[PDB]
Swiss-Prot record, chain A:
Protein name, per record: Small ribosomal subunit protein eS12
Record PROSITE patterns: RIBOSOMAL_S12E (PS01189)
Native organism: Saccharomyces cerevisiae (strain ATCC 204508 / S288c) (Baker's yeast)
Subunit structure: Component of the small ribosomal subunit (SSU). Mature yeast ribosomes consist of a small (40S) and a large (60S) subunit. The 40S small subunit contains 1 molecule of ribosomal RNA (18S rRNA) and 33 different proteins (encoded by 57 genes). The large 60S subunit contains 3 rRNA molecules (25S, 5.8S and 5S rRNA) and 46 different proteins (encoded by 81 genes).
Molecular function terms from GO: structural constituent of ribosome
Cited SUPFAM superfamilies: L30e-like
Its biological purpose: Component of the ribosome, a large ribonucleoprotein complex responsible for the synthesis of proteins in the cell. The small ribosomal subunit (SSU) binds messenger RNAs (mRNAs) and translates the encoded message by selecting cognate aminoacyl-transfer RNA (tRNA) molecules. The large subunit (LSU) contains the ribosomal catalytic site termed the peptidyl transferase center (PTC), which catalyzes the formation of peptide bonds, thereby polymerizing the amino acids delivered by tRNAs into a polypeptide chain.
UniProt keywords, alphabetically: Cytoplasm, Isopeptide bond, Ribonucleoprotein, Ribosomal protein, Ubl conjugation
Gene3D superfamilies documented for this protein: 3.30.1330.30
GO CC annotations on file: cytoplasm; cytosol; cytosolic small ribosomal subunit
Coiled-coil segments: none
Family note: Belongs to the eukaryotic ribosomal protein eS12 family.
Main localization, broad class: cytoplasm
Glycyl lysine isopeptide (Lys-Gly) (interchain with G-Cter in ubiquitin) crosslink, residue number(s): 68, 78, 97
From Swiss-Prot, chain C:
Protein's recorded name: Small ribosomal subunit protein uS10
Compartment(s) where it occurs, according to its Swiss-Prot or TrEMBL record: Cytoplasm
Modification(s) after translation: N-terminally acetylated by acetyltransferase NatA. Also partially acetylated by NatC.
Family: Belongs to the universal ribosomal protein uS10 family.
Annotated Gene Ontology cellular component terms: cytoplasm; cytosol; cytosolic small ribosomal subunit
Signal peptide: none
SUBUNIT field: Component of the small ribosomal subunit (SSU). Mature yeast ribosomes consist of a small (40S) and a large (60S) subunit. The 40S small subunit contains 1 molecule of ribosomal RNA (18S rRNA) and 33 different proteins (encoded by 57 genes). The large 60S subunit contains 3 rRNA molecules (25S, 5.8S and 5S rRNA) and 46 different proteins (encoded by 81 genes).
Keyword annotations from UniProtKB, A to Z: Acetylation, Cytoplasm, Isopeptide bond, Ribonucleoprotein, Ribosomal protein, Ubl conjugation
Origin species: Saccharomyces cerevisiae (strain ATCC 204508 / S288c)
Curated annotation (Swiss-Prot), chain D:
Phosphoserine carried by residues: 6
Keyword Zinc among UniProt keywords: yes
GO BP term, pick one: cytoplasmic translation
GO molecular function annotations of the record: structural constituent of ribosome; zinc ion binding
Top-rank lineage group of the source organism: Eukaryota
Record text on subunit structure and interactions: Component of the small ribosomal subunit (SSU). Mature yeast ribosomes consist of a small (40S) and a large (60S) subunit. The 40S small subunit contains 1 molecule of ribosomal RNA (18S rRNA) and 33 different proteins (encoded by 57 genes). The large 60S subunit contains 3 rRNA molecules (25S, 5.8S and 5S rRNA) and 46 different proteins (encoded by 81 genes).
Keyword terms: Cytoplasm, Metal-binding, Phosphoprotein, Ribonucleoprotein, Ribosomal protein, Zinc
Entry function: Component of the ribosome, a large ribonucleoprotein complex responsible for the synthesis of proteins in the cell. The small ribosomal subunit (SSU) binds messenger RNAs (mRNAs) and translates the encoded message by selecting cognate aminoacyl-transfer RNA (tRNA) molecules. The large subunit (LSU) contains the ribosomal catalytic site termed the peptidyl transferase center (PTC), which catalyzes the formation of peptide bonds, thereby polymerizing the amino acids delivered by tRNAs into a polypeptide chain.
Full-protein residues shown: 20 to 56 of 56
Protein name: Small ribosomal subunit protein uS14A
Cofactor binding summary note: Binds 1 zinc ion per subunit.
Length: 125, 262, 103, 37, 46
């Protein structure tokens, strides 16, 4: 559906606070097998990934979702890797550069339980 | 009570595991991590007289195959107690190498290692040898930054002992990017040793601090000089001008004055 | 009505004699049937030790020694009297044992 | 083995005690073994 | 990111007591994995 800037930025805050709970599943085959086991309490998608066959496998399950398959779109892959803690770790004084990721699966919620609750109550409309 | 089939089978594999040195683990021993109730199963296997090889391999299986709370229950009920037993019943007060490899490998899951092993140890009789051994183990194993931050933050709120200062060494030499609240808690730990002239003092205000605390003050003031405020910098300068060291103290004040406020 | 055999083991003879005299003078003073303190022979426990911890000179020997004395007094008493004497009589150096059965 | 001084030599194995003799010769009086004769 | 992790560290005894009050169960044979008794029969037959 339509994604706002505030929802994507809040979800990136959720990813930056859910990496530190050791409850983020970052990797494409990890995302596929987290969707297979039912452990995927959220899968995050990037709409600016150049390859689209694996996206079309995901989008075949996005237009017809199951009861335990939540999905959400954001803007950039390198920004997703930044706020998943992989791509850039930019704090007030430090920097380190890795290539960012495409899909990140939230497994454990942690300190963003109410944040993810209102994000899931906002995506369902 | 447990069924007697489980009792005789795990008594049998307990009688097997007394002299294990090499090879593969038993099949009934490798399904206890897959069990919903582990704790009744491992008690029948007579936990105290394990071989060191099955201590290390049980550490490997029961860290790499569990959750965090499950592994902290495992390490606090099993590995911490056998660690204590294998130091205080050892004859030169040493540690076996397989037990050393077990305590090394159990920090691959750091939170379970901390809250099952380190934090009961410092409150239930942490002497010099236990903490020297555990500070060496914590010196070896590479940890993530936040678990080092939170375990250090527990070490700051502990009452003073030179073993706690040794643990503060080992977690302050990692040079990780701490949060600013962890640096604030380090400042608050470094407030309780200074002397307050307004009429509020304790044991730590006038006690003798060794060279180990001033090296810790040097380490914290050289790494985290840029993550403090100016009021905390002045309070640490008060701590310097009250209880500075002969050979470390001028270095600490000249590196504390070379820090920028946040 | 229960018959209790009390056996006392001690390495020191003075505290054992004081305990046995206190037991006899406490048992006779409130009208219980009993036997006297039956005196087992003193066990002498001997071990041999070298005079030479280091290998210099000829090999000669000494002996370390122990003395262990055993007494037992048979009593007939109710349960509360046996319990209060067992609570009272606990002293260092003398071991007190309470036997219920007579088989 | 001897749990006082890591002694792997001079053990006495009587009564499940496993002290070496060079540690038994000073701790005998605290155990109860006193020199009489 | 810090307040979630220091309450389980500074009050780890109280959180352990809360986790033991919330998540303690007795030993049930059927509530394990369904093939646990099969490996129990396989090991004792050597
Ligand atoms: Zn010795």
């Amino acid at each position: 559906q339509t994604a706002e800037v505030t929802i994507e930025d809040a979800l990136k805050v959720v990813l930056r606070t859910a990496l530190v709970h050791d409850g983020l599943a970052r990797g494409l085959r990890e995302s596929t097998k987290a969707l297979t086991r039912g452990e995927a309490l959220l899968v995050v998608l990037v709409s600016s990934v150049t390859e689209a066959n694996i996206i079309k496998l995901v989008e075949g399950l996005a237009n017809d979702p199951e009861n335990k398959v939540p999905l959400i779109k954001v803007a950039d892959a390198k920004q997703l890797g930044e706020w998943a803690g992989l791509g850039k770790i930019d704090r007030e004084g430090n920097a380190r550069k890795v290539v960012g990721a495409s899909v990140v699966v939230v497994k454990n919620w942690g300190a963003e339980t109410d944040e993810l609750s209102m994000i899931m109550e906002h995506f369902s409309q | 009570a447990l069924p007697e089939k489980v009792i005789k089978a795990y008594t049998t594999v307990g009688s097997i595991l007394k002299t294990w040195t090499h090879g593969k683990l038993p099949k009934l021993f490798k399904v206890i991590p897959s069990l919903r109730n582990w704790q009744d199963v491992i008690y029948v296997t007579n936990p105290e007289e394990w071989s060191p090889h099955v201590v290390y391999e049980a550490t490997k299986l029961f860290v790499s195959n569990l959750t965090a709370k499950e592994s902290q229950k495992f390490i606090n009920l099993i590995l911490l107690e056998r660690f204590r037993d294998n130091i205080e019943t050892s004859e030169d007060h040493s540690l076996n190498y397989h037990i050393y490899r077990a305590v090394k490998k159990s920090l691959y899951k750091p939170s379970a290692f901390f809250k099952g092993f380190l934090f009961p140890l410092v409150e239930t009789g942490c002497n010099v040898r236990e903490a020297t051994i555990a500070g060496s183990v914590l010196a070896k194993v590479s940890v993530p930054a936040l678990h080092s931050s939170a375990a250090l933050s527990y070490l700051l709120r502990l009452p003073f002992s030179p073993p706690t200062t040794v643990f503060i060494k080992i977690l302050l030499d990692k040079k990780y990017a701490l949060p600013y609240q962890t640096v604030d808690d380090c400042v608050y730990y470094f407030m309780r040793f200074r002397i307050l002239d307004d009429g509020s003092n304790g044991e730590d205000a006038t006690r003798v601090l060794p060279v180990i605390w001033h090296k810790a003050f040097l380490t914290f003031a050289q790494r985290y000089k840029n993550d403090i405020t100016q009021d905390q910098r002045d309070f640490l300068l008060e701590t310097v001008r009250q209880r500075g060291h002969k050979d470390i103290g001028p270095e600490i004040r000249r590196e504390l004055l070379a820090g920028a406020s946040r | 009505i229960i018959k209790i055999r009390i056996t006392l083991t001690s390495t020191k003879v003075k505290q054992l004699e004081n305990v046995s005299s206190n037991i006899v003078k406490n048992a006779e003073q409130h009208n219980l049937v009993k036997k006297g303190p039956v005196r087992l022979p003193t066990k002498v426990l001997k071990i041999s030790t070298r005079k030479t911890p280091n290998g210099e000179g000829s090999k000669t020997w000494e002996t370390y020694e122990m003395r262990i004395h055993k007494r037992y007094i048979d009593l007939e008493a109710p349960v509360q009297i046996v319990k209060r004497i067992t609570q009272i009589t606990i002293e260092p150096g003398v071991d007190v044992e309470v036997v219920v059965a007579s088989n | 083995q001897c749990r006082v001084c890591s002694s792997h030599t001079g053990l006495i194995r009587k009564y499940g005690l496993n002290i070496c003799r060079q540690c038994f010769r000073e701790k005998a009086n605290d155990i109860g073994f006193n020199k009489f004769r | 990111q810090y307040d979630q992790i220091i309450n389980g560290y500074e009050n780890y005894e109280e959180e352990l007591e809360e986790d033991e009050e919330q998540n303690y169960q007795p030993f049930d044979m059927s509530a394990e994995r369904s093939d646990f008794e099969s490996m129990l029969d396989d090991f004792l037959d050597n």
